[PDB]
Write a protein that binds this ligand. Structure first.
Ligand SMILES: *C(=O)[C@@H](NC(=O)[C@@H](C(=O)O)c1ccccc1)[C@@H]1N[C@@H](C(=O)O)C(C)(C)S1
Length: 471
C-alpha cells in the first residue's frame, strides 16, 4: 500500500521526486504458480500483448521470487488497459491504485535522490537519508543541487566514461562561497523509473588523490619559507631510500610555478623532504582529508588518512604526489572549494542554504591566491591540462594520473584520470572535480581524458550561471 511522500526539488524548485496517483499491475507470484502458473491458456498472451511484455520476460519476472507475495508488472497503466487486465480474471494478477514515486530527472539525479523499496520506504540516497522527514509529518525537501547543472555535469561525464571505456567516472561541482553541492553525478548510472552500481561512487569510492595534492604541497612549502614564488629547484632524477623519483616530462630545473605546470614529482618530493613529515599531514587535514563530509547519505566514507608518527623518506615523498591516503571525490571537491575560497574551509550540504555561510580560515588569503595564480599555468600553453581551457575565462586546475593500487597493496598499470580546479580564477565561484576510473581506450592521462570533460562542464556552468568573463 505505497502512500504519497513529500516532494524533493532542486535549489530553484524543479521537481526531482514526485508522488503521482496511478493504477499499477502486480503479480502474486506464489498464488499465480500454485493456480497453474503461465499455462497454454490464451489469456496469458492477452496480458503479455496488453502489457507490451513478451511471455518469456513475463515468465522470468514471476519465476524469480516463486513464493513471493509482490512483483510489479507495470507501475502505471491507463483505465482502459487496467480494466481489460482485470476482466481477464487471471489468478495471481492484481490492479491497485497507489502513489508512484516518479523521478522526472531520471538516471541523471538517480545516485543523489535514490529510490524506494516495494513497501515504499527509501533504501538509497536522499530518498533513504530523509525517509522519515518525507513520509507521513510529511515535508517537501529543497536540495542544494541545480537540475540544469546536474544535467550538464552528468551528460559530459557519462559520454566521456563511454568514449574512454572506463570502469566508472564521477564529477562533483561545489559552490566556493556556500559549500553547497550544485552537481554530483556518476557513470555508470541506472533508471529509477523502470521495472528493469547503485551506490553513489562520489561518497563511497575512496581513491589515492595522486598529483591533485600538489597545490597543497606548494602552499605548505611557501608558508614554511622552504621556497619563494620565483624559486627554481633541480628536478633531475634522484634517489630516496634507494627508490628513484623521476619525472615523466624530463626537466633539469623548474620554478615553483613550473612544478605545478609540468607536474614535477621530483619538485614536490624535494619540497616535502625540506619539511617535517607532519607539515603535509597538517595541511591535507586542514583542507579536510581524513574528515567526514557529514551529508547524512548512506555509505558516506571519510576515507583512509595516516595517523603514523614515524614516516620513511620515500613515504614522505609519495605523500607529496598523493600516494599513502584514500579520499572520496566529494572530499577532493571540498579541498578545491577551500583553495577556491582562498583558504576558507566551509562545510558541505545537499540542501539549499541561506547565505552567508561561516567558514574556518586554514591558510592566509594571499598565500592561496599566489598558488591559485600558479595553477593557471596548467591550462595555459606549456601546461599539461590545456584541453580544459575555456574560451574567454581564466582557470586554476591541476591534472592527475594516479596508479591504481590492487587488493594486495601492489600497483597495476591501470589509472585514475583526474582533473580538479576552480573558476573563474580571478574570483572563483565553482570548484569542480572530475575522475575517470580505469580508462581502457588508449589515452589514460588526466590532461588527455578528464581535462576536456572539466573544460566542457565548467564552460556551461559559467555561462548558465551568467558569470562575467575573465580575459
Ligand atoms: C601525478 O599524478 C603524477 N603521476 C605519477 O606520479 C606517475 C606514477 O604514479 O607513476 C605516472 C602515472 C601515469 C603515467 C606516468 C606517470 C604526475 N602528473 C601526471 C598528470 O598530471 O597527468 C603525469 C602523468 C604527467 S606525472
Amino acid at each position: 500500500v505505497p502512500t504519497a511522500r513529500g516532494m524533493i526539488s532542486d535549489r530553484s524548485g524543479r521537481p526531482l521526486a514526485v508522488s503521482v496517483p496511478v493504477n499499477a499491475v502486480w503479480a502474486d507470484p506464489k498464488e499465480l504458480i500454485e493456480q497453474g502458473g503461465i499455462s497454454l491458456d490464451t489469456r496469458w498472451k492477452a496480458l503479455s500483448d496488453a502489457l507490451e511484455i513478451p511471455l518469456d520476460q513475463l515468465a522470468t519476472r514471476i519465476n524469480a521470487n516463486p513464493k513471493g507475495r509482490f512483483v510489479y508488472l507495470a507501475r502505471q497503466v491507463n483505465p482502459a488497459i487496467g480494466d481489460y487486465i482485470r476482466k481477464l480474471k487471471l489468478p495471481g494478477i492484481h490492479l491497485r491504485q497507489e502513489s508512484r514515486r516518479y523521478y522526472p530527472a531520471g538516471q541523471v539525479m538517480a545516485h543523489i535522490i535514490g529510490v524506494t523499496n516495494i513497501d515504499g520506504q527509501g533504501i538509497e540516497g536522499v530518498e533513504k537519508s530523509f525517509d522519515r522527514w518525507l513520509t507521513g509529518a510529511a515535508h517537501n525537501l529543497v536540495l542544494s543541487v541545480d537540475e540544469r547543472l546536474q544535467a550538464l555535469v552528468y551528460r559530459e561525464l557519462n559520454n566521456a566514461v563511454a568514449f574512454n571505456k572506463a570502469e566508472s567516472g564521477t564529477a562533483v561541482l561545489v559552490d566556493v562561497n556556500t559549500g553547497e553541492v550544485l552537481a554530483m553525478a556518476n557513470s555508470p548510472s541506472y533508471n529509477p523509473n523502470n521495472l528493469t552500481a547503485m551506490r553513489n561512487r562520489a561518497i563511497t569510492d575512496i581513491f589515492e588523490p595522486g598529483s591533485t595534492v600538489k597545490p597543497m604541497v606548494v602552499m605548505t612549502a611557501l608558508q614554511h619559507g622552504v621556497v619563494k614564488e620565483n624559486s627554481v629547484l633541480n628536478t633531475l632524477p634522484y634517489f630516496v631510500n634507494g627508490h628513484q623519483i623521476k619525472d615523466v616530462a624530463r626537466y633539469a630545473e623548474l620554478s615553483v610555478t613550473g612544478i605545478l605546470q609540468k607536474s614535477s614529482n621530483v619538485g614536490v618530493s624535494k619540497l616535502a623532504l625540506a619539511m617535517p613529515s607532519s607539515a603535509l599531514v597538517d595541511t591535507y587535514s586542514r583542507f579536510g582529508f581524513g574528515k567526514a563530509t557529514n551529508l547524512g547519505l548512506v555509505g558516506e566514507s571519510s576515507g583512509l588518512y595516516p595517523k603514523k608518527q614515524r614516516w620513511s623518506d620515500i613515504e614522505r615523498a609519495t605523500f607529496s604526489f598523493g600516494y599513502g591516503l584514500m579520499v572520496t571525490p566529494l572530499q577532493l571537491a571540498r579541498v578545491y572549494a577551500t583553495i577556491g575560497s582562498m583558504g576558507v574551509y566551509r562545510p558541505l550540504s545537499i540542501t539549499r542554504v541561506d547565505p552567508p555561510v561561516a567558514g574556518e580560515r586554514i591558510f592566509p588569503e594571499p598565500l592561496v591566491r599566489t598558488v591559485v595564480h600558479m595553477m593557471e599555468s596548467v591550462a595555459l600553453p606549456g601546461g599539461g591540462g590545456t584541453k580544459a581551457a575555456i574560451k574567454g575565462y581564466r582557470i586554476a586546475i591541476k591534472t592527475g594520473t594516479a596508479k591504481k593500487v590492487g587488493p594486495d597493496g601492489k600497483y597495476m598499470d591501470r589509472y585514475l584520470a583526474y582533473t580538479a580546479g576552480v573558476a573563474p580564477a580571478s574570483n572563483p565561484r565553482f570548484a569542480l572535480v572530475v575522475v575517470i576510473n580505469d580508462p581502457q581506450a588508449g589515452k589514460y592521462y588526466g590532461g588527455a581524458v578528464s581535462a576536456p570533460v572539466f573544460g566542457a562542464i565548467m564552460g556551461g556552468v559559467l555561462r548558465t550561471m551568467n558569470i562575467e568573463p575573465d580575459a
